[PDB]
Amino acid sequence: SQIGLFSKICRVTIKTLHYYNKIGLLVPAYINPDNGYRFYTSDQLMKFHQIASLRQLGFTITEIVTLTQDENSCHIIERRRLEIQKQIRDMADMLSRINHYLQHKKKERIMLYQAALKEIPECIVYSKRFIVPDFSSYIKLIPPIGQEVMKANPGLTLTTPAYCFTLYHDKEYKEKNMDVEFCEAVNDFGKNEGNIIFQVIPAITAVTVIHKGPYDSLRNAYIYLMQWVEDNGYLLTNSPRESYIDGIWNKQDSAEWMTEIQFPVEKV
Amino acid sequence: SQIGLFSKICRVTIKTLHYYNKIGLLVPAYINPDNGYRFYTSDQLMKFHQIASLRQLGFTITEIVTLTQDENSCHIIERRRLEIQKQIRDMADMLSRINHYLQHKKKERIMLYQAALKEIPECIVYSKRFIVPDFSSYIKLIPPIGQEVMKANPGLTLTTPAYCFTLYHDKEYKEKNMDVEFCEAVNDFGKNEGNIIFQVIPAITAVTVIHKGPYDSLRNAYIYLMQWVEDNGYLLTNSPRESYIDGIWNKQDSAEWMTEIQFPVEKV
DNA sequence: GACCCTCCCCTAAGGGGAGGGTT
DNA sequence: AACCCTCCCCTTAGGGGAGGGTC
Ligand code: 118
Numbered sequence: 225s226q227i228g229l230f231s232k233i234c235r236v237t238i239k240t241l242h243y244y245n246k247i248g249l250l251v252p253a254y255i256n257p258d259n260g261y262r263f264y265t266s267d268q269l270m271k272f273h274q275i276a277s278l279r280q281l282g283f284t285i286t287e288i289v290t291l292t293q294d295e296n297s298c299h300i301i302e303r304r305r306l307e308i309q310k311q312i313r314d315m316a317d318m319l320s321r322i323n324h325y326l327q328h329k330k331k332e333r334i335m336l337y338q339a340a341l342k343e344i345p346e347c348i349v350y351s352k353r354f355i356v357p358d359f360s361s362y363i364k365l366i367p368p369i370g371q372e373v374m375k376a377n378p379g380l381t382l383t384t385p386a387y388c389f390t391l392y393h394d395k396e397y398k399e400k401n402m403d404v405e406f407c408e409a410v411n412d413f414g415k416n417e418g419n420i421i422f423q424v425i426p427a428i429t430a431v432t433v434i435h436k437g438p439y440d441s442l443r444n445a446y447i448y449l450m451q452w453v454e455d456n457g458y459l460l461t462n463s464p465r466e467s468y469i470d471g472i473w474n475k476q477d478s479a480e481w482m483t484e485i486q487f488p489v490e491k492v
Numbered sequence: 493s494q495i496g497l498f499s500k501i502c503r504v505t506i507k508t509l510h511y512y513n514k515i516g517l518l519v520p521a522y523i524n525p526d527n528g529y530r531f532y533t534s535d536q537l538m539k540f541h542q543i544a545s546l547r548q549l550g551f552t553i554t555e556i557v558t559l560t561q562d563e564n565s566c567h568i569i570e571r572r573r574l575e576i577q578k579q580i581r582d583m584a585d586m587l588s589r590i591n592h593y594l595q596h597k598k599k600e601r602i603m604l605y606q607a608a609l610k611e612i613p614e615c616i617v618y619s620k621r622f623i624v625p626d627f628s629s630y631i632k633l634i635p636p637i638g639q640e641v642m643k644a645n646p647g648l649t650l651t652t653p654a655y656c657f658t659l660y661h662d663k664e665y666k667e668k669n670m671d672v673e674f675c676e677a678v679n680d681f682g683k684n685e686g687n688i689i690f691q692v693i694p695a696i697t698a699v700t701v702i703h704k705g706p707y708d709s710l711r712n713a714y715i716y717l718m719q720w721v722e723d724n725g726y727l728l729t730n731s732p733r734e735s736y737i738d739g740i741w742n743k744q745d746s747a748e749w750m751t752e753i754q755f756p757v758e759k760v
Numbered sequence: 761g762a763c764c765c766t767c768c769c770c771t772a773a774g775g776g777g778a779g780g781g782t783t
Numbered sequence: 784a785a786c787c788c789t790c791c792c793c794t795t796a797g798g799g800g801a802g803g804g805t806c
Pocket residue numbers: 363366367369370371386388408468469471473
């Protein structure tokens with residue numbers, strides 16, 4: 225049985241037998257020193273059978289080189305089992321997300337927003353929690369709040385990149401008298417002055433949507449994320465953040481403003 | 493925004509941005525010509541968010557290039573949906589297989605048979621179907637047929653590699669009235685004088701186990717396969733085959749014999 | 761004709777490092 | 784030192800082909 229007859233026995237490629245013999249797994253019985261031909265015996269067929277049996281399970285080749293000779297190694301199978309469990313969970317996640325994408329595209333010709341999960345680190349922020357009558361008044365009150373803090377603390381250095389955001393501590397849709405908390409990430413701790421405090425905001429896994437446009441139409445964005453959380457079975461773990469990237473401070477065009485809504489979320 | 497600041501903005505490595513620029517996926521807004529330094533803008537982060545949102549759905553990079561550059565492309569989302577559902581089926585199958593493997597390797601310290609799900613193509617065999625009083629007597633009466641068919645069919649060449657098996661057409665277990673069919677694959681049709689005839693044996697996907705040793709313990713392997721067939725929810729679609737690799741024809745030691753039991757199954 | 765060998769290069773999505781540039 | 788660049792090799796499980804040899 226030359227390599228061709230063996231490759232037709234196992235229904236495997238000649239390149240596969242070559243690769244195996246190179247890697248050390250399934251070395252043939254006889255390598256003729258005259259011509260280097262590879263001759264296999266039925267024992268190699270029995271060995272290739274279990275090689276293919278493990279390869280049909282998802283085991284990488286390096287795991288098979290450890291499973292075919294180290295007959296005591298059983299933990300490396302439970303490890304692959306946990307990996308496969310994670311993979312089924314992530315594939316179900318992806319499938320739900322794809323179905324939601326298709327539904328949203330069947331609704332409207334244009335996909336306005338696109339959700340993305342990202343891991344946001346913990347960060348040392350200075351914060352001010354207070355009530356606002358409307359959104360515009362809140363936007364107007366932010367800059368003096370920032371100025372007070374940068375003046376009262378010499379050496380206050382913002383974080384690069386500038387992670388400057390807000391949190392909406394309401395649980396229902398509150399149009400006026402919103403319990404809003406403005407925050408800005410700094411390099412390190414400062415001193416509490418006025419109603420402005422400092423705190424450490426924890427790391428989250430947040431589903432985010434970048435809204436490009438004027439602020440008075442941010443509501444749609446929030447609704448979309450809400451729908452995203454309702455459809456794909458995630459759950460809002462904390463108050464929603466809203467991060468400001470571009471705006472009246474960065475670009476004087478009102479239609480080029482960019483804010484990254486971030487729902488802190490966890491899967492259920 | 494230099495590549496470091498932007499790479500920290502989007503929270504991905506530098507080499508990823510280099511790669512996305514090389515393939516034309518995410519191009520910097522402004523490259524300094526002599527330095528080659530890459531500088532991005534907010535509307536590069538707006539696109540990296542879309543890239544990552546699509547890449548969390550498992551879309552390969554070229555699919556992302558098309559999804560972002562080619563509009564009305566819902567067919568690629570549909571293709572990826574079908575592929576994810578297929579991978580869900582395959583991963584669940586692997587999970588059941590590895591649960592069964594762990595249930596076995598924990599129950600006994602040696603794994604006697606690994607089970608491999610392989611595809612067997614259709615063949616043209618000569619077959620004799622007949623009642624058998626005793627399986628040991630079943631082995632002896634086969635070489636008479638081997639004499640007879642080569643006598644009556646001159647120039648009949650056996651298939652290479654040799655496929656010589658037995659269909660067990662019995663729907664339940666019995667010890668002295670086994671209704672079997674001995675089949676052996678040849679290349680062309682032939683004359684069907686006698687109870688021996690010629691027929692085409694259809695292609696089957698089948699779980700196979702290689703049994704080494706004498707034929708009196710063979711039922712063990714069969715038991716195992718049935719266990720396997722019931723554990724992973726497979727359905728036995730056809731009659732069980734038994735292919736003879738090594739035996740009295742090749743080897744004198746009754747411990748180096750080799751058969752391959754094949755259960756035609758489908759996943760239901 | 762059939763069949764076989766080694767050698768080199770290719771995959772997708774970047775990772776790691778080496779050598780060289782500037783402020 | 785701090786960033787940044789390009790170039791070259793590397794990762795899986797083998798596929799494809801060229802050039803050259805063997806039954
Ligand atoms: C403290 C508090 C707010 C701001 Sb900004 C800002 C700057 C960079 C990145 C993100 C936000 C600001 C306003 C006027 C002039 C200069 C900077 C700011 C503005 C509106 C809403 C939220 C934040 C700055 C410091």
